[PDB]
Design a protein around this nucleic acid. Structure first.
Ligand code: ZN
Ligand code: ZN
Ligand code: ZN
Ligand code: ZN
Lengths: 77, 76
DNA sequence: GGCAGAGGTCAAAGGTCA
DNA sequence: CTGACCTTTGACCTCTGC
């Protein structure tokens, strides 16, 4: 009955943009895609996305978001 | 129009669990972020008001905590 | 109907920099 | 260090199309 975000391991509201996601992960994906935002990383793209420290590397979040099958094409827009 | 429990200034909004001015919000963030502890030169009951808020950082932080600002809420 | 999976709001967190 | 002011986040909403 409990489902966890494939990005950050937070309680997941459900499948969003093709991925079991927390509400935070959804909204990041949207804004990133809607604003055509690519970010950069300052730690050799090694950044580990955890519920606690997910807002550390926007770049590394979007990497994991796409890695885990969130789909730009699914965000309206 | 609501007033900051720490300094008594006009509050921006509720900040870390208490109706706070931006200043005390800022103070609180940086204090917890840099795990700053503070020393008092006036026996630790320094009056904290808008006009004279920055005399004692120590006494301010005490007030911040006492009036219910929650460190845990401030993030890393 | 019923509900997943899109959308949006705005307080409360964040970061900026004179 | 400070705080006026600006940006992001994510809990909680609604809509609507299978
Ligand atoms: Zn997540
Ligand atoms: Zn990174
Ligand atoms: Zn104040
Ligand atoms: Zn003092």
């Amino acid at each position: 009955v409990v489902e966890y975000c494939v990005v950050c391991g937070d309680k997941a509201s459900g499948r969003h943009y093709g991925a079991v996601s927390c509400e935070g992960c959804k909204g990041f994906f949207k804004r990133s895609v809607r604003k055509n935002l690519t970010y950069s990383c300052r730690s050799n793209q090694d950044c580990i996305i955890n519920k606690h420290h997910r807002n550390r590397c926007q770049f590394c979040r979007l990497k994991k978001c796409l890695e885990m099958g969130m789909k730009m094409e699914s965000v309206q827009s």
